[PDB]
Every structure is written in C-alpha cells, then in structure tokens.
C-alpha cells in the first residue's frame, strides 16, 4: 500500500471532518507518486479538498 497511518498529530485533524476523505485521497495520491510537487499528477483530489473545506471553516 504505502499508506499514511492517520493517527499522526494535526495531519489527523485534516484527515477528519466533512472533507477527511479528500485529505486521505489527496495525500495518498501524492505519497503513491513522489514525482516533484505535492500531487503534480493528482490535482483533482487537492481541488476537491479546497472545494470541500471552502464550505467549512471550523465546523468539525
């Protein structure tokens, strides 16, 4: 797999809430890649994380 293990402090606080899966999906898509930039091949997951968290400031 190569997964994150989501108990890690403050990363776990983004891997949570309404948009937690957008963090799971974005940061796993990046960690599976390691090309050059955070999600250079994955931008739709990080875009969904913006598109989700732009609804929710401090809600979770």
């Amino acid at each position: 797999n190569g997964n994150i293990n989501w108990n890690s402090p403050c990363l776990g606080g983004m891997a949570s809430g309404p948009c937690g899966e957008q963090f799971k999906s974005a940061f796993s898509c990046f960690h599976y890649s390691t090309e050059e930039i955070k999600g250079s091949d994955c931008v739709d997951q990080f875009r969904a994380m913006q598109e989700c968290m732009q609804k929710y400031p401090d809600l979770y």
Binding site: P9, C10, L11, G13, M14, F23, A26, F27, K38, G39, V43, F46, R47, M49, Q50, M53
Partner: peptide, 21 residues
C-alpha cells in the same frame, strides 16, 4: 513532540493549488 511537522506545507500547498488550478 510538537503537532503537525508537515502541516504548514499541507495548508499552504492546498492554498497554492487553490490559486493555480
């Protein structure tokens, strides 16, 4: 240890992509 050693890069990369895409 402190909380979130990659967390500014989490927030600021999703902001930078929030401007770029």
């Amino acid at each position: 240890e402190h909380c979130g050693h990659l967390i500014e890069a989490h927030k600021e990369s999703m902001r930078a992509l929030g401007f770029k895409i």
